[PDB]
Design a protein around this nucleic acid. Structure first.
Ligand SMILES: [Zn+2]
Length: 251
DNA sequence: TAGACCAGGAC
DNA sequence: CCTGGCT
């Protein structure tokens, strides 16, 4: 899931678990548990805690309990559902939190790429995987000034800058390409080559793009006509990822 | 800072 | 070979 989807999950999952008390935690693929390393410790510490909240940080979900925070990354295929303890589990269910009311929070992940870290709440933000995460794209903390300051300090591409989680939190490939298109900037441009007016336009489109999705011009459209100028959208490789852009609209 | 690395299986 | 985030 991308940031906007994770936010949707955060928003809808919360009412379904808030105020529920954990009675058991069952783990069927321990490698998903990253901290504590020992999955039995992970399971033992959660038992008895009540769910008090659910926040999002980039693409990470942060379940807030009484004493601990559970940091969860879905990666590709991770998904959460709330259902009855009386019904059979669906396939690829790897972690289940059982509540005292007979309902369960189930984690499914065909890829088994997702991760879970538990820490005392007060230290979750200074530990992996949250420790170095950049500001929320939709928050005041992520401003043109902040982007500009990171821009003029690096030699790498503007796309690579935007994909850097330390620069801005959870800005996916899709939204990087779309935002660059809307800002009229080639993904291959050196971040330092961007003008004050460009970084400002980029910031504005970043916020608008992710903001609209939370509440496609180029991504996956290669071969197809640009929606603004009719030029065939191109796809190459930039900073490891597939990169989509209009050779005419973007400079 | 550029890749390499890696979670696990898919075709 | 697909993909976000240690050498
Ligand atoms: Zn165009």
């Amino acid at each position: 899931p991308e940031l906007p989807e994770v936010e949707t999950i955060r928003r809808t999952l919360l009412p379904l678990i808030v105020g529920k008390t954990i009675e058991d935690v069952r783990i069927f693929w321990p490698n998903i548990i990253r901290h504590p390393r020992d999955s039995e410790a992970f399971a033992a510490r959660m038992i008895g805690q009540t769910v008090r909240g659910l926040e999002r940080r980039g693409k990470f979900l942060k379940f807030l309990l009484d004493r601990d925070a559970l940091i969860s990354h879905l990666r590709m295929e991770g998904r959460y559902a709330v259902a009855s303890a009386l019904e059979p589990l669906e396939p690829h269910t790897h972690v289940v939190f059982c509540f005292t009311d007979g309902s369960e929070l189930r984690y499914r992940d065909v890829a088994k790429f997702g991760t879970m870290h538990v820490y005392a709440k007060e230290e979750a933000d200074r530990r992996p995987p949250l420790a170095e995460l950049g500001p929320e794209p939709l928050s005041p903390a992520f401003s043109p000034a902040v982007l500009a300051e990171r821009a003029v300090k690096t030699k790498r591409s503007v796309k690579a800058l935007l994909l850097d989680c330390t620069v801005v939190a959870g800005f996916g490939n899709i939204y990087v390409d779309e935002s660059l298109f809307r800002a009229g900037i080639l993904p291959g441009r050196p971040a330092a080559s961007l003008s004050s007016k460009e970084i400002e336009r980029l910031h504005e489109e970043m916020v608008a793009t992710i903001g609209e999705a939370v509440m496609l011009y180029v991504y996956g459209r290669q071969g197809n006509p640009c929606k603004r100028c009719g030029t065939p959208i191109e796809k190459t490789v930039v900073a490891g990822r597939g990169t989509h852009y209009c050779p005419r609209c973007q400079r």
